[PDB]
Design a protein around this ligand. Structure first.
Ligand SMILES: NC(=O)c1ccc[n+]([C@@H]2O[C@H](COP(=O)([O-])OP(=O)(O)OC[C@H]3O[C@@H](n4cnc5c(N)ncnc54)[C@H](O)[C@@H]3O)[C@@H](O)[C@H]2O)c1
Ligand SMILES: NC(=O)c1ccc[n+]([C@@H]2O[C@H](COP(=O)([O-])OP(=O)(O)OC[C@H]3O[C@@H](n4cnc5c(N)ncnc54)[C@H](O)[C@@H]3O)[C@@H](O)[C@H]2O)c1
Ligand SMILES: COc1ccc(Cn2cnc3cc4c(cc32)CCC4)cc1C
Ligand SMILES: COc1ccc(Cn2cnc3cc4c(cc32)CCC4)cc1C
Lengths: 258, 258
């Protein structure tokens, strides 16, 4: 596999349907040694889910806490000498932030919380993981949505946070490039997941994409997963600060619905 | 290999140093059956160069002629049933178009000729190759430069043509998506090639990139090659109408201060 022997940490595995699950499948297939994080009381769920992937570790990390992030790389640094990649696949905003009108529903705290978890957490992982990733063609890949680029209904504060994430990807790439670390993001098309079912009429947003995009379809977690895998390989060492759209071509059209 | 049994046409192989050479190396390693094009009197050069790649065909194609493009898919259609990918790696503008001041040097014919060969030729290959590429998760990949996005010294009409190419990539993706064909471009960082030595102080433009970009380096033809390969694989079926920068992260920075 093109990830043979590489040591990669995966965040945000929560379900059979999670994008992280797809990323894991791809990376396992390609021969990576994987470690997974989990939040609070999902310990048992995640341990069972990712068992099939032979993880070198399944450790607690709520990216709300600087302490846990620091402890993550302590515990991880015990079982691994160095680390080849980090996969950021974490997003949250309080539910009141995703209902209807952006200016109506937006709040100072919901804005803060969404950025803290969905954007800042990335540079945090980069901050603490940096020394384990020095000079070994290491890699970081964040997950983002086109809601960062264009104003959309319902996405609201999450869209603003995603924009924050993407700039952070860029500034993390400038910061970590001197250590040979590459930093990139995959902008996924909508996928039916646990985070996804946190918004109202998803089945049709998902059908709109299918109708209006060039390949007339939705992307699966393997399409996204396989792309993340590539971006953590020696093949992608010319690529950093980049956003690769995996959305069946949605990003490149306008009015494609005649 | 992730391109096992796939039938891919490669244009613009001219040298040991060509981007196409790197693309070939990558695709061969991944188990693709390859065919190559050549212009006029380079027959012997290209035949010898690409011998190592076991080509199913080495055929003449000057993209200036609609007839030759049509004949290419006739001859190719003889030795292959269908075709999985086309790799566009062709660019030209008259030398008078690349000296100094854009408005000084630009001409109606140089503008026409550059677009004809560097941009139109892509939609031409798509036009004629379309039937051989129907409903088999087929792929097109064009090579482009950041001169398309931003105004640069010397690049001039070639920059304008590259912008034309990138839009053509987008419109070809909308056109061919219904047939399951994906269309994408790789925006390569500067690389010391035969086309490249057609501009004056390349050694330093190449050194500026190395200094100012996040990974503090230049990309090699394998980094580009390996990315083109990926974009022609079943792993990239969620990706179309996209421009992936392979430029050591140059695209994402401003003011690498000196
Ligand atoms: N579903 C989509 O349409 C889609 C599209 C583009 C991008 N994405 C992005 O992909 C990522 C993965 O989401 P998903 O769609 O697989 O949904 P998911 O619900 O399966 O995963 C989201 C993850 O966020 C994690 N998370 C939330 N708060 C956390 C915290 N405080 N600390 C640590 N982890 C926390 C959860 O464990 C969960 O695994 C997200 O960044 C998301 O925005 C999703
Ligand atoms: N060298 C760089 O810095 C760089 C950076 C970004 C993008 N690119 C692009 O990559 C592609 C390949 O260029 P390269 O750098 O490998 O150099 P190269 O000189 O090896 O390749 C250019 C190719 O164009 C072909 N060509 C010229 N006129 C043609 C015609 N009329 N019909 C068919 N083919 C014709 C030549 O045979 C040649 O193989 C071009 O699209 C180029 O703009 C190069
Ligand atoms: C414009 O319409 C949409 C397209 C895709 C998605 C799915 N989607 C993508 N990233 C996400 C992050 C979160 C949620 C959903 C996420 C809930 C909290 C955290 C959501 C919307 C509103
Ligand atoms: C920042 O300035 C540059 C970076 C890269 C390149 C290399 N380069 C890329 N595509 C090309 C096409 C042609 C030439 C060269 C090409 C000559 C014939 C046609 C050129 C310039 C001016």
């Amino acid at each position: 596999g093109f990830l043979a022997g590489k040591k990669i940490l995966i965040t945000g595995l929560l379900s059979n349907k999670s994008i992280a699950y797809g990323i894991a499948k791809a990376m396992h297939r390609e021969g990576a040694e994987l470690a997974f994080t989990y939040v609070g009381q999902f310990k048992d769920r995640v341990e069972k889910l990712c068992a099939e992937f032979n993880p070198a570790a399944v450790l607690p990390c709520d990216v709300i806490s600087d302490q846990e992030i620091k402890d993550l790389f302590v515990e991880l640094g015990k079982v691994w000498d160095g680390l080849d990649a980090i996969v950021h696949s974490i997003a949250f905003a309080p539910r009141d932030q995703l209902e209807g009108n952006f200016i109506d529903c937006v709040t100072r705290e919901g804005f803060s919380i969404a950025h803290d978890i969905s954007a800042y957490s990335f540079a945090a992982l980069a901050k603490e993981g940096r020394s384990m990733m020095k000079n070994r063609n290491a890699s970081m890949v964040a997950l983002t949505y086109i809601g960062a680029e264009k104003a959309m209904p319902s996405y609201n504060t999450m869209g603003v946070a995603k924009a924050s994430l993407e700039a952070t990807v860029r500034y993390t790439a400038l910061a970590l490039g001197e250590d040979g670390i590459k930093v990139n993001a995959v902008s996924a098309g909508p996928i039916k997941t646990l985070a996804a079912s946190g918004i109202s009429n998803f089945k049709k947003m998902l059908d709109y994409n299918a109708m209006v995009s060039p390949l007339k379809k939705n992307v699966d977690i393997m399409e996204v997963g396989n792309t993340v895998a590539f971006l953590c390989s020696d093949m992608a060492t010319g690529i950093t600060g980049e956003v690769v759209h995996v959305d069946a071509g949605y990003h490149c059209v306008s009015m494609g619905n005649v």
